[PDB]
Amino acid sequence: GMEVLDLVTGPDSVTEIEAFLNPRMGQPPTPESLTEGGQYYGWSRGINLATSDTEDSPENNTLPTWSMAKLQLPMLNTLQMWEAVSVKTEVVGSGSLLDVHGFNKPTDTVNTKGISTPVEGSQYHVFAVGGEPLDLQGLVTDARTKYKEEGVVTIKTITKKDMVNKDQVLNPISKAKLDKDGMYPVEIWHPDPAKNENTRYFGNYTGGTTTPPVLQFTNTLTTVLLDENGVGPLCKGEGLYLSCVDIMGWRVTRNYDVHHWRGLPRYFKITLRKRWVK
Amino acid sequence: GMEVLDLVTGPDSVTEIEAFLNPRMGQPPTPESLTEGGQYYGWSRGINLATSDTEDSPENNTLPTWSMAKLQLPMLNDTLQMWEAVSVKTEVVGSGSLLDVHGFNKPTDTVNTKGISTPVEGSQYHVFAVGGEPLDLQGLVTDARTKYKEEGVVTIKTITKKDMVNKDQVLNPISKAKLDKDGMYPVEIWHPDPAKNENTRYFGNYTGGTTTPPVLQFTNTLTTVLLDENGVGPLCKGEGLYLSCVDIMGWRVTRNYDVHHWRGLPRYFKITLRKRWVK
Amino acid sequence: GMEVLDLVTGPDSVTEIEAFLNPRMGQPPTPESLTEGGQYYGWSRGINLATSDTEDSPENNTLPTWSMAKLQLPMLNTLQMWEAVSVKTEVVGSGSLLDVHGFNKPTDTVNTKGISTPVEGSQYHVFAVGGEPLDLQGLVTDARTKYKEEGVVTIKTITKKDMVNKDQVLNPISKAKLDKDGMYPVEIWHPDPAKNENTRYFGNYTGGTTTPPVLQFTNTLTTVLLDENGVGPLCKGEGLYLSCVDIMGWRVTRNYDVHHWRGLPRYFKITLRKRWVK
Amino acid sequence: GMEVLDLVTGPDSVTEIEAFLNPRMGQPPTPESLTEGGQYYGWSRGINLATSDTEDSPENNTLPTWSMAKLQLPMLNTLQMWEAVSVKTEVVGSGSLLDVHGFNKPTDTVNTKGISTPVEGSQYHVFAVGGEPLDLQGLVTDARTKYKEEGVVTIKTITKKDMVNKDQVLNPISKAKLDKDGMYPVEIWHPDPAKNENTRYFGNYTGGTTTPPVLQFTNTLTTVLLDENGVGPLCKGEGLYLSCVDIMGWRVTRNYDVHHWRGLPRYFKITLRKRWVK
Amino acid sequence: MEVLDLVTGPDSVTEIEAFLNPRMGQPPTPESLTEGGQYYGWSRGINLATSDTEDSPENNTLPTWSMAKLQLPMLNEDLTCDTLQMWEAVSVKTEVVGSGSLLDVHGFNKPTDTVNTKGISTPVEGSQYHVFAVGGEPLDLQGLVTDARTKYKEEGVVTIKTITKKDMVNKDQVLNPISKAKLDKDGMYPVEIWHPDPAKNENTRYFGNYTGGTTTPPVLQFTNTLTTVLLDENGVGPLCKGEGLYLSCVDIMGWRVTRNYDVHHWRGLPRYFKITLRKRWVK
């Protein structure tokens, strides 16, 4: 159904669905143990640095990846399709960053006093709602970065060849789809503006090392998903795709300034309506 | 109860109510004595730091908590009526007090112990809500290993009767509560729950950092509309109106080992309500 | 007249009045001599600090206070009242902060070179227009602060009793009216949102120690004073009240980092119309 | 032309005029030689500081002044007058601040390495369009400042008397008109909000010492000059007055941190229409 | 040229897309990641003046304008016809792609813990410059420099001297109307020299912003939901002369800083354009 017709009316013609996507900062959800690694859930493991200009081998659990979920919608089948009309979305838990009583690098390092330095630095917030996987365009800081072959999907996973210098700019060969949760690094894979005809995405980036994190939250804000012609994302095979990443910055430890990324979960409440298509 | 009909007209069909909620930064309102602890009212007590990666036990009087009040509305009740909250004028009062730079805080010139008394700076957090039932809360913490006190505060373990788990550092749907007591629910634990709160409107913002300048605006000319996309405001169950807030401006820092004290300010609410026919 | 009726028409039914309010930062307008203290006019005197946690005695001339003026309107008397419809207001003189050639603490303290550090830090801008004095609510940093009994109006002035711990939050007992220029400290007295039914006020605060000052100015911006029912402040006994404070930050001297508050004057042009009342 | 009537229609009833105003930061346009001082054109000369609290004698070529031009409109003469309807204005050249390869104070002063520090600090942008000279109100940081008598127009030029302490706040005696380019210091002379009935002005100030400069530029933005009654500035004797100042901050040299103000030129394109007047 | 009605019928509206890669200083070739290709997307190390009178920046340290000319379908069989058709640019969706890549703080840049050579690899920070333009002819440029004494290379960059055949004059540090050019070549016009000319560009829309400083956090937004309208105050978009559509941009994110003498390299990001065009009758 490529030709969009009238809205469907009658019993059950509109539905609301909700979901939360937890962040994928590097430590997986398991093991759950708060001694054996689970204490880092919601965070990355300690960022490991390159050893030379030609030896940059980041560990998978130090690389934040995209969150995604595919939600199955009520069975439907001139055919009908589910059309995503609007979304209320919220990043939850910023108040938790008011914990300045922990064991991070303290504000008075001479005397080991003050407060536990709160999360600060680079921030990245993107969400998307669509009727098929988010289309991704690869672009990296360094085409020489030696990403692991297993456990992450990177440009080489797709091309079966090493990255080239064009991958540090826009190389149309380096494309993928966001089809797995916690696998696609956000430092590699960006929303592709040349595709995503059936997805809406919204992103912002704020960089720096000690930048104050900023966040707003309210249950009163609706994001309209209709395009310029009044048509929202159309859900292929009754599948709805949610994608996001919400990085708040890093915490810094008392030992060699080890940094850990902090991510927060995102709530989605999507309103959908049935649409006649041909 | 559930089905929303026409607006009620006639004598006393609209009312305005006002309240102020004082901040709950850690030191309680009593003792009142300015030498026995009352001098910290409006502030937290000095923030105490973890002693290791596995030993983090913050004292309750160092943890800002939610402010809340339940206000009783005029009695009501062929068919039923409910009070509907239409709009609110809200204001955080007292930012001018932060222009006191003549006190005994850590001074700006630490070479000569001179300059000015460093004003309140750092992390800031402002949330308010108005609803017809308690604000629904979702728990989420920095560290599921934090040893919150088991007395005098409501934490995740209070609700679940079990220790926190690693999922409590992200979204764990088991870890939920209702904001039903003033000065009891820490803001570093309990967040507005976007999966509930159908009958409350909430508005929040967070700005982090350690030395960030505090910013605030105030005017008596701004109205916040509380009507939803269908033109319906919060409906007050059992004629109860719930106000919730927290307004953290940052910390002051003392001259002794950089002890930080949170500063909070009071929030004014003036709520306009109308009677609604319901079925 | 509590009941508001129709607008009055005919000759001289609309009037426009203008005024400027000079800042009240601590040094009075006199003595005028530029060697006897007049050189500090527009500024506070050097901020003096507490000597202990229990001994905080700020000098009056170090405390910025509210500016205010009561303007008399044309005689009038179903009666008529003057109704304030709108105001054009502007803070004048921000360009003067571009003087970085004076004798302030220099930007290179190592060598005593560079430029004279410009005014920076905490900023506070409030104005109000009303038909009666601005209603004030007291709230202080420290209820133990030992304000002078003479020369400033403080909480103790009103209550005849020492401040209490509730005065560090909202204590409804601690209220006053802005009825005198250069007397009510801005670190004590705030617009009262529980009153001021017949006044409109607009305030903003930006804190910190070295924060860059920011200001906009134009003669093209009108502030509407009408409430949600289309009614502006009604001038009791044909008196119009103007209130403000405009703090730009501090300058810092070359001697023990002594700080002086800087304030700027505010212009008001108020449009008023006659209103029938009963 | 006190009473404003209908718009004039017919051939040549609307006109557009354009101009650029170069900045007046302190070094005059001549000498042109890049070894005789011409290399400082667009900049001030090195800011010279006071030698004590009572000895502040800034050199004229260290003080940015207002730019202005009077443009002659087509001859006209119930009479007709030119009415300025709107202006498109832009500050040109912010990209030049991306030169970080010069000999300014370097970013690493420990090793004398890094990049040439770009222009930073206090910024001031004002423009005005009017039918007569911009009305100015004097206000200074320090009434004791010993401005040169020749080569700048200062408060003493107007009053024939030394500045008074009231000149540090609003002194209504201290007024002038912007009638000469490169002569009225911006640290003294501000748009007068109590006059300028026939001019629109728009100003902003951002202070500090190392503040990042910010600028936007586009050819798609129109500033409407009509007042609340739908009347723009009326050009007396067919003269159109343009006034501006656009300070981007300072560069800092490698010798004693000497600062030089940087200004940029401003483009104006003004649309005017003929108006019947009586 | 007099602008008449919109043309209707099959194929009267079209959308075209393009990406422009940044031109920060290292050219796209050599492609080898050991011979210079590893710097593509970046400048080479910024080299500094050696005195107040000796400022000779290398070409590969100077970011230049990106541009592309797109050729649209021919509309007019006979240009002597009284009424003709032109392509009119109505709107553009534009996006700067790849800000997420700046979240790589695991490389070999100057580290944040300089005592121990630990912490994180300092991310890109500092001065930022974002400009894009869409027009029916080349972007008109106005020259203006920091220093008229700067000794730009004569070969490899188009500078004021390239145009005038004479050394820069002191007026080139402000607005000198003699110092004008057109953006007619990609990767050649330095952005520290050449600015959109507000006195021309009647048939182009440009949008620019500058944020300065040395350690300023970079900020960027991106969405596929934002349309930039290109119609002027009369409802007319850029009209494509000889069916040529010109895209111009620069998108500087700041610098990375190396572990060797704090050497800085500019970082740029590519820009996507999707332009909606419609046929317009003209005479």
Author numbering:
A (entry chain E), C (entry chain B), D (entry chain C): 33 to 109, 116 to 316
B (entry chain A): 33 to 109, 115 to 316
E (entry chain D): 34 to 316
Anything the authors wrote about it?
Murine Polyomavirus (MuPyV) is a double-stranded DNA virus that can induce tumors in newborn animals. Viral attachment is mediated by the major capsid protein, VP1, which forms pentameric capsomers that assemble into the T = 7d icosahedral capsid of the virus. Sialylated oligosaccharide receptors are engaged in a shallow groove on top of VP1 formed by loop structures on the protein surface, similar to other polyomaviruses. The differences among the three strains have been mapped to amino acid variations at two positions, 91 and 296, within the receptor-binding region of VP1.
The laboratory-derived RA strain shows limited spread and induces few tumors of strictly mesenchymal origin after a long latency period, while the naturally occurring PTA strain has disseminated infection and causes multiple tumors of epithelial and mesenchymal origin within a short time. MuPyV found in feral mice has the VP1 sequence of PTA, but the virus is controlled by an intact immune system. While RA bears a glycine residue at position 91, this residue is replaced with a glutamate in both PTA and LID. While the receptor interaction pocket of RA VP1 has been described, no structural information for the pathogenicity-defining amino acids at positions 91 and 296 in the pockets of PTA and LID has been available. PTA and LID both carry a glutamate at position 91, and this side chain is being held in a characteristic position with the carboxyl group facing away from the glycan receptor due to a salt bridge formed with K186, as previously predicted.
